[PDB]
C-alpha cells in the first residue's frame, strides 16, 4: 500500500482514511481515524508515511507497513490543525493552526512539542514551503500572507485584499509563481524574484483572477507549472493556464436543476505527475479522477459514508 507506484488517499468526516488504487477505483485499505474529522492529508516526500491533520492532533500512519494504526501522534496544541507541509530531506514537518501558530516539528526526534513557533494574529488556514526549502508562506484569516524566512527568522508580510481570510496558497515547482486564494473567491498571482542564493525572494504582483463567487477552498499548481487549479464552494474545480490566466477546463458537480441544495463542495485537488489528470475531494463522499484536457470523469472513488475534505496523491521514483 506504499509498494504500489500510485498513492491515493482520501479522508473526511466518517472517521476513516481510505487508500485507493487509482487505475481501478477499488479501495486498497481503510485506516481508523476516530474522534475527529481530517482537515489535511500529505504524504511524506520519501513516501514512508501519510500525515492526517485534525483537531488538536496530527496523526501519522505508515505506508510501507500495511495494516497498523498510527506510528506518530502530535498532541498538546489547541483548536484545529489546518495545513501540513514537509521538507524534502524528510526531517521537517510544518503546520498551520487555528491557534495562530506556524509550527516546525522535528520528525526524527522524540519531543511531543515542536522545534520552532511563528505566532501571528489570526488563525492560519494554510502553510506551504517555497521549493528552495528556506521559506514558509503562511496565510491567515485576517487576510495577511506571511513569508517566514526559516534562516533569518525575519518575517515579512503582505495583504492583497484586506480583512478577507486567505484560504490556500501554493507555489509552482519551478518557483516562478505564487498563488493565493481567499474567501471572496479571488485568486492572486505573484511573480517570484530569484535572489535565492543571498536571501531576497521578492513578490511582484501579476494578476487577480475572479476565480469564483463562493469561497475558494484550495489552489494548486500543476507540476508542469502549465496550470493552476482552483477549488471552490461553488461545486467546482477550475483549471487556469499560466500563459494567459485564462480558464482551460472546468470540473463541476452541480445538479443541472436549480432546485437541488448544493450537493457538495469541492474541497481539494491534486494533479498527476505528468499533469494529465487531476484528483478531486468532495462533500458528496467521493474522490474523483478527471482528465485535465477534456474535463471527462475518468474515475469515481466511492467508499466513505460521510464527506471527503482531503486528498493526498503521489508519483515518485
Amino acid at each position: 500500500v506504499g509498494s504500489d507506484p500510485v498513492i491515493l488517499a482520501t479522508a473526511g468526516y466518517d472517521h476513516t482514511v481510505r487508500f485507493w488504487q487509482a487505475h481501478s477505483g477499488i479501495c486498497t485499505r481503510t485506516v481508523q481515524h476516530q474522534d475527529s474529522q481530517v482537515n489535511a492529508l500529505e504524504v511524506t516526500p520519501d513516501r514512508s508515511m501519510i500525515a492526517a491533520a485534525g483537531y488538536q492532533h496530527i496523526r501519522m500512519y505508515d505506508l510501507n507497513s500495511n495494516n497498523p494504526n498510527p506510528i506518530i501522534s502530535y498532541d498538546g496544541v489547541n483548536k484545529n490543525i489546518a495545513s501540513v507541509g514537509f521538507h524534502e530531506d524528510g526531517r521537517w514537518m510544518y503546520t498551520g493552526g487555528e491557534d495562530c501558530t506556524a509550527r516546525i516539528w522535528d520528525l526524527r526526534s522524540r519531543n511531543l512539542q515542536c522545534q520552532r513557533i511563528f505566532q501571528v494574529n489570526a488563525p492560519i488556514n494554510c502553510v506551504c514551503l517555497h521549493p528552495n526549502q528556506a521559506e514558509l508562506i503562511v496565510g491567515d484569516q485576517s487576510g495577511a500572507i506571511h513569508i517566514w524566512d526559516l534562516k533569518t527568522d525575519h518575517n515579512e508580510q503582505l495583504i492583497p485584499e484586506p480583512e478577507v481570510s486567505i484560504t490556500s496558497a501554493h507555489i509552482d515547482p519551478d518557483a516562478s509563481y505564487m498563488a493565493a486564494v481567499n474567501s471572496t473567491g479571488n485568486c492572486y498571482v505573484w511573480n517570484l524574484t530569484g535572489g535565492i542564493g543571498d536571501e531576497v525572494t521578492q513578490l511582484i504582483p501579476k494578476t487577480k483572477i475572479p476565480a469564483h463567487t463562493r469561497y475558494a477552498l484550495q489552489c494548486r499548481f500543476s507540476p508542469d507549472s502549465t496550470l493552476l487549479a482552483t477549488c471552490s464552494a461553488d461545486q467546482t474545480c477550475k483549471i487556469w493556464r499560466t500563459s494567459n490566466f485564462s480558464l482551460m477546463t472546468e470540473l463541476s458537480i452541480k445538479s443541472g436543476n436549480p432546485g437541488e441544495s448544493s450537493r457538495g463542495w469541492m474541497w481539494g485537488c491534486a494533479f498527476s505527475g505528468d499533469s494529465q489528470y487531476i484528483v478531486t475531494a468532495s462533500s458528496d463522499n467521493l474522490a474523483r479522477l478527471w482528465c485535465v484536457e477534456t474535463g471527462e470523469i475518468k474515475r469515481e472513488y466511492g467508499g466513505h459514508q460521510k464527506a471527503v475534505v482531503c486528498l493526498a496523491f503521489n508519483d515518485s521514483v
Binding site: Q37, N39, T167, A233, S262, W265, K306
Partner: protein, 1058 residues
C-alpha cells in the same frame, strides 16, 4: 366601509409577498410598493425601492433612483453629469427640473426653463408650465406666472390652483373663491384615478387641501380686519404642532406670504429656518435668515455681523457653526455677547424691563453655545476649563431657572474633577502631589454638587442622570467636610420624590464604611421611610437578612425607625417576604443542591472542610424544627437519616477515619436518590401544606409587589391564590398569583437560586430608554418601546418576576408549529449531525458548509407562517407584524449597547395579541457572552433567519433598518443619560461579580466595559480610528448579526438556524 377597505389590501399583500417569495420580478416589485402605499405604510415601501435599486438597475438613470428616494440634491448633480455628457434630452431636462422644484430652487428653475424654449415640444411644454409657474411664484414674478398659468389647462387641478393665487395678488376674491372650490373637485375626482401618484400626491393632496384651506384663510385675512390675530394664531399653532417636511412648508409659507411679509412675522420664519437647519438644508436656512437680516449673504465676510435684530443674528451664527465655518462662528459669538451686555447695561432706561428679560435669556443661550463650542474646538484642558466654566456660570446668571444652563455648569465641574483624577492616574503609571490635588478636586467638587442639585429641581420627573451624578460625587468624595456640607444642604432643598428613582443604588451603599457618607444615607432613607414607606420595605427587608453583618444592622435601624409610624406594614412586609423565600426553594430542593455540591467537593475535589461548610447551614436550618406541613412530611421521611448522617460526620471530626465518613455518605445518598425520584413529581404546590401563613393573609396594607408608585392609589395584597403551578425547569419556578385590592389578579414567577439584582438595574435602564423614546418625536410617532416587567429581588438566591400576559417563547411557538406540521422539532440539528458527526470541532470553513446544508434543507418560514395562521383577519396580521419588526429592532440596538448576550429561543418571546417582542433573562451583559471560553458568541443580537422571514419581504431594508437608525440616533444623542445608568451598575459594589467569570483590579476591568459602551455610543466600536455615523454602524451590525460564519459558531442550543 373604510374599515373593510384596508383588509382587502392587507390580504392581497400577503399573497403578493408570497409571490415575491416564489420569484422576485420587476412585475411583483412594482405591484408591491403600490399596495404598500395605499396601505399608508410609507417606510416599508421605501425598503421595496431599496431592493429595486440593489437588484434591478433597470429603471436606472442613477438620477431617477436618487429622485425616487427623494434625495434631490444628489439627483441634481447626477442629472448635471448625465446631461453635459449627452445632448439636450427633453426627458433628462424635466428630470433635472423636478429636482430644482422639490429643492425650492426657483432662481434656477425659472432660468433653465427660459434658457430652453424651442426644445419644448407640446408634451415637454405642458409639464414645463406647471413648474415655471411656481418658480415665478417663488420669485414674486406675477407677470411670468400669468404667462405660464395661461399655458396650464383649466382642467388640471394645478391650473385651477394657480388661477386662485394670481387673483389673490390682484385682489379678486369671488374669482379666487370659485377657483379653490373647483381646484378641490378637480383633485377629489383626480385621486379616484389613483394611478398617477398613489401616496406622494395623497399625502401631497393634504399639502394641497391645507394650501387650499390656508388660501381660504388668506381670503379671510385680506377681507376681515379682526381675524388678524386669530388666523395668525391658527397659523402659528399648526406650525409647532403641524409636522410637514421642508419642501411642503416652502409652499405653505408662500400662501401666507401673499398677506404677511417676513419682517412682521419673524418668529414663524425663524422657526421655519430652524427646521431647514435641523433637517440639513443649510443653504436654504441661510437664504431665509439673509432675507430676515435685510443684509448679508456671507459677502462682506470680514465685517462684524449686524446686531440690528439680535434674535436673527443668533440663528445665523449657529447656522454658520452647523455649516463648515466654525472658527468664524465662535469668533462672531464672542463678539456678539460683548455687544449684547453693553446694549443691556448702558441702553437700559428702566421702562424696558421686558426687553431686558428676553435679551438676558438670549445671552444665556449664547453663553451656553460659547462654552459648548470652545470644547468642540479645544477640548478639556488646563486653559479651557476655567474659560468654559466662566461661560457656563455666566449663562447661570442670565437665566437662573434654566435646566440646561445649570446642567452644563454641573457637568463641566464634574468633568473638571475627572480631568484631574484621570491626569493623576496617568501620573502614577510613570506629598505636594496629593495636597494640591486635594485642593484641586475640592475646588471643582463642591460646585458640581451644587449645580446638579439646582438642575435636579429644574427637571422633576426627568432627572435620573443628574440624580445619579449627585450620588457619584456623594459616594466618591462626600466624606470631605466641604463636599458633605453641600450634600446636606442639597438633600434638604430637593424634593423627596427624587430619590425613589434611585432607591436600589442607595441601599447598595447602606453599609458604607466612610462615616459621614453613611450618616446621610441613613438619614435620607429614614425620611424616604416617613413619606412613601412602600417604596422601601421590600428592598429593606432583603437587606435586613444579609450574611454581611453591617448591611443587615443598618437596614434594621431604618426598619426600627419605620415602625414608629408604619409598624404593621413593616411587619407584613417582613412576614410575606419570609414565606416567599420558604416557598421559592422547599426544604428538599435545598438539600438536593447542597448534596450535588458536597459530593463535588469531597469525591470530585478532596475537600472535607469545604463540604462541612455546605452541609452545616442545612442541618442547623432543621435544628429550628419544621414550621409547615410540607416541612414535617419531609422531616418524617428523611429527618431521621440526616440527623444520624451528621452524627457520623462529627465522629470523623474527632477520629479522622474515612470509615466514619463513608457511613455518613451511605446515609446521604439514600435521601439524595429518594429526592431525585420525587422531583418531577412537583408540578404543583399547595399553600395549605407549603406556607399556611400566606394562605391566611387577607386584606393586608402591604402593596402588591412592585406595583407601588406615588401617582396612583395603592394596590394592596388582598389575598394569595392557594395553588402554585410549578413550571418544570432545572430551576423550577413557581407561578405565584395574588389578588389585588383593586379587583385584578397579579401573577409572578417565584424563583430560587437566580440573582435578580442584575435584571433589576437592567429594568431600570429600559425605563430610561423608554423615556427617551417617548420623548423623541419620531420614536413616539412609531410607538417604539421596550416591554418591561416587575423585578423584585427577595434575597441573593430568590425573587419575583412580573408575569407578562399573552406571551409564548419563540421556542414554544416553533415547537407547536413543527408538531402540528409533523416536522421533527430538532431537524436542523439532526441534519447537521448526520452530515458531520464532529460538528463542534470543525474549521470555520467546514462548519459553514454544514450550517448551510441544514438551512437549505429546511423551511425558514415557520415563524412567518404560524403568525399568519394565528391571526383572526389580515389587517390584524399586518399590524402585529409592523409591531413585531419595530419592537425587535428596538431591542437589537439597546441590547447591543447593553451587550446583552444569550438570546436563545427561550429567552425572547412574542406577545400574541400585539405582536410585540419581549426579552427575559439579563444574566449575560456587556461583552460577557462573547468573552467566554467554551462556545463564545459572535453575534451582537439575534437576527436569525426565521425572525427575518417573519418581517415583510424587503424587511431589513424596510422598517427594521429605519427603526434601527432611529433608536440608535436617540441613544447617541442621550449617551450621557445611558452612561450614568450603566456606570451605576458597573461600579456597583455588590454586582461586580459578573466579569470575574471570564476565568471560566476589577477597577481596571470595569473601566474597559464602560469604554466599550462609550465606543458603541459614538461609533468607535469597529475601528478605533474611524468614527462611524449611525446608518453605517447599523449596517455593520446587521452584516455581523447575519454572517453565517458567525451563526455557525453559536452553541447549538441557541438555534442559529431559527
Amino acid at each position: 366601509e373604510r374599515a373593510a377597505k384596508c383588509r382587502a389590501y392587507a390580504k392581497a399583500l400577503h399573497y403578493k409577498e408570497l409571490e415575491f417569495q416564489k420569484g422576485p420580478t420587476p412585475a411583483i416589485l412594482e405591484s408591491l410598493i403600490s399596495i404598500n402605499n395605499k396601505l399608508q405604510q410609507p417606510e416599508a415601501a421605501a425598503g421595496v425601492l431599496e431592493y429595486a435599486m440593489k437588484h434591478f438597475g433597470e429603471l436606472e438613470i442613477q438620477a431617477t433612483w436618487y429622485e425616487k428616494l427623494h434625495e434631490w440634491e444628489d439627483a441634481l448633480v447626477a442629472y448635471d453629469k448625465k446631461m453635459d455628457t449627452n445632448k439636450d434630452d427633453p426627458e433628462l431636462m424635466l428630470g433635472r427640473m423636478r429636482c430644482l422644484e422639490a429643492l425650492g430652487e426657483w432662481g434656477q428653475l425659472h432660468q433653465q426653463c427660459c434658457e430652453k424654449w424651442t426644445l419644448v415640444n407640446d408634451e415637454t411644454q405642458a409639464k414645463m408650465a406647471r413648474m415655471a409657474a411656481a418658480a415665478a411664484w417663488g420669485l414674486g414674478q406675477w407677470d411670468s406666472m400669468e404667462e405660464y398659468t395661461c399655458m396650464i389647462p383649466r382642467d388640471t387641478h394645478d391650473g385651477a390652483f394657480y388661477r386662485a393665487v394670481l387673483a389673490l395678488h390682484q385682489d379678486l376674491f369671488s374669482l379666487a373663491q370659485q377657483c379653490i372650490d373647483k381646484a378641490r373637485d378637480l383633485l377629489d375626482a383626480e385621486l379616484t384615478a389613483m394611478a398617477g401618484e398613489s401616496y406622494s400626491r395623497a399625502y401631497g393632496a393634504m399639502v394641497s387641501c391645507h394650501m387650499l384651506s390656508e388660501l381660504e384663510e388668506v381670503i379671510q385675512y385680506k377681507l376681515v380686519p379682526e381675524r388678524r390675530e386669530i388666523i395668525r394664531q391658527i397659523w402659528w399653532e399648526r406650525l409647532q404642532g403641524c409636522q410637514r417636511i421642508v419642501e411642503d412648508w416652502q409652499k405653505i409659507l408662500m400662501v401666507r406670504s401673499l398677506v404677511v411679509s417676513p419682517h412682521e412675522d419673524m418668529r414663524t420664519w425663524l422657526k421655519y429656518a430652524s427646521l431647514c437647519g435641523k433637517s440639513g438644508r443649510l443653504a436654504l436656512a441661510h437664504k431665509t435668515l439673509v432675507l430676515l437680516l435685510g443684509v448679508d449673504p456671507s459677502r462682506q465676510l470680514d465685517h462684524p455681523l449686524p446686531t440690528v435684530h439680535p434674535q436673527v443674528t443668533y440663528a445665523y451664527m449657529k447656522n454658520m457653526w452647523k455649516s463648515a465655518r466654525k472658527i468664524d462662528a465662535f469668533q462672531h459669538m464672542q463678539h456678539f455677547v460683548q455687544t449684547m451686555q453693553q446694549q443691556a447695561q448702558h441702553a437700559i432706561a428702566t421702562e424696558d424691563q421686558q426687553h431686558k428679560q428676553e435679551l438676558h435669556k438670549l445671552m444665556a443661550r449664547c453663553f451656553l453655545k460659547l462654552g459648548e463650542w470652545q470644547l468642540n474646538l479645544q477640548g478639556i484642558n488646563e486653559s479651557t476649563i476655567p474659560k468654559v466654566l466662566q461661560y457656563y456660570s455666566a449663562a447661570t446668571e442670565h437665566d437662573r431657572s434654566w435646566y440646561k444652563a445649570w446642567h452644563a455648569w454641573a457637568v463641566m465641574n464634574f468633568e473638571a474633577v475627572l480631568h484631574y483624577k484621570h491626569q493623576n492616574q496617568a501620573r502614577d503609571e510613570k506629598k505636594k502631589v496629593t495636597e494640591d490635588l486635594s485642593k484641586t478636586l475640592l475646588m471643582y467638587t463642591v460646585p458640581a454638587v451644587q449645580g446638579f442639585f439646582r438642575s435636579i429641581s429644574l427637571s422633576r420627573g426627568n432627572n435620573l442622570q443628574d440624580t445619579l451624578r449627585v450620588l457619584t460625587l456623594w459616594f466618591d468624595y462626600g466624606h470631605w467636610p466641604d463636599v458633605n456640607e453641600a450634600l446636606v444642604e442639597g438633600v434638604k432643598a430637593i424634593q423627596i420624590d427624587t430619590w425613589l428613582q434611585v432607591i436600589p443604588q442607595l441601599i447598595a451603599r447602606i453599609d458604607t464604611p466612610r462615616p459621614l457618607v453613611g450618616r446621610l444615607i441613613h438619614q435620607l432613607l429614614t425620611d424616604i421611610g416617613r413619606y412613601h414607606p412602600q417604596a422601601l420595605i421590600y428592598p429593606l427587608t432583603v437587606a435586613s437578612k444579609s450574611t454581611t453583618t453591617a448591611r443587615h444592622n443598618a437596614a434594621n435601624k431604618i426598619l426600627k425607625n419605620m415602625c414608629e409610624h408604619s409598624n404593621t406594614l413593616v411587619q407584613q412586609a417582613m412576614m410575606v417576604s419570609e414565606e416567599l423565600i420558604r416557598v421559592a426553594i422547599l426544604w428538599h430542593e435545598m438539600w438536593h443542591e447542597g448534596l450535588e455540591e458536597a459530593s463535588r467537593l469531597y469525591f470530585g475535589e478532596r475537600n472535607v472542610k469545604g463540604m462541612f461548610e455546605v452541609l452545616e447551614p442545612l442541618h442547623a436550618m432543621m435544628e429550628r424544627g419544621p414550621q409547615t406541613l410540607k416541612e414535617t412530611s419531609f422531616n418524617q421521611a428523611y429527618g431521621r437519616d440526616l440527623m444520624e448522617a451528621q452524627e457520623w460526620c462529627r465522629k470523623y471530626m474527632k477520629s479522622g477515619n474515612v470509615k466514619d465518613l463513608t457511613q455518613a455518605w451511605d446515609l446521604y445518598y439514600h435521601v439524595f436518590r429518594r429526592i431525585s425520584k420525587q422531583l418531577p413529581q412537583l408540578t404543583s404546590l399547595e399553600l395549605q401544606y407549603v406556607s399556611p401563613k400566606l394562605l391566611m393573609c387577607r386584606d393586608l396594607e402591604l402593596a402588591v409587589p412592585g406595583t407601588y408608585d406615588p401617582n396612583q392609589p395603592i394596590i394592596r395584597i388582598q389575598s394569595i391564590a392557594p395553588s402554585l403551578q410549578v413550571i418544570t425547569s432545572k430551576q423550577r419556578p413557581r407561578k405565584l398569583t395574588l389578588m389585588g385590592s383593586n379587583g385584578h389578579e397579579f401573577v409572578f414567577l417565584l424563583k430560587g437560586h437566580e440573582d435578580l439584582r442584575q435584571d433589576e438595574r437592567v429594568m431600570q435602564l429600559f425605563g430610561l430608554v423608554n423615556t427617551l423614546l417617548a420623548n423623541d418625536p419620531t420614536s413616539l410617532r412609531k410607538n417604539l418601546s421596550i416591554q418591561r416587567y416587575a423585578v423584585i429581588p427577595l434575597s441573593t438566591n430568590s425573587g419575583l418576576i412580573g408575569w407578562v400576559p399573552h406571551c409564548d417563547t419563540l421556542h414554544a411557538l416553533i415547537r407547536d408549529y413543527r408538531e402540528k406540521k409533523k416536522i421533527l422539532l430538532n431537524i436542523e440539528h439532526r441534519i447537521m449531525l448526520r452530515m458531520a458527526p464532529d460538528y463542534d470541532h470543525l474549521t470555520l470553513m467546514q462548519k459553514v458548509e454544514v450550517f448551510e446544508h441544514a438551512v437549505n434543507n429546511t423551511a425558514g418560514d415557520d415563524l412567518a407562517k404560524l403568525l399568519w395562521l394565528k391571526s383572526p383577519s389580515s389587517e390584524v396580521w399586518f399590524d402585529r407584524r409592523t409591531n413585531y419588526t419595530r419592537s425587535l429592532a428596538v431591542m437589537s440596538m439597546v441590547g447591543y449597547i447593553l451587550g446583552l448576550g444569550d438570546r436563545h429561543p427561550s429567552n425572547l418571546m412574542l406577545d400574541r395579541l400585539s405582536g410585540k417582542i419581549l426579552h427575559i433573562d439579563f444574566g449575560d451583559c456587556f461583552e460577557v457572552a462573547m468573552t467566554r471560553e467554551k462556545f463564545p458568541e459572535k453575534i451582537p443580537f439575534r437576527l436569525t433567519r426565521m425572525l427575518t422571514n417573519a418581517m415583510e419581504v424587503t424587511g431589513l431594508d424596510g422598517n427594521y433598518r429605519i427603526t434601527c437608525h432611529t433608536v440608535m440616533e436617540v441613544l447617541r444623542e442621550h449617551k450621557d443619560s445611558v452612561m450614568a445608568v450603566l456606570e451605576a451598575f458597573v461600579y456597583d459594589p455588590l454586582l461586580n461579580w459578573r466579569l470575574m467569570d471570564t476565568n471560566t483590579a476589577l477597577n481596571k476591568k470595569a473601566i474597559q466595559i464602560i469604554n466599550r459602551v462609550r465606543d458603541k455610543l459614538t461609533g468607535r466600536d469597529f475601528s478605533h480610528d474611524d468614527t462611524l455615523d449611525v446608518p453605517t454602524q447599523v449596517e455593520l451590525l446587521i452584516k455581523q448579526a447575519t454572517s453565517h460564519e458567525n451563526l455557525c459558531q453559536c452553541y447549538i442550543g441557541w438555534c442559529p438556524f431559527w
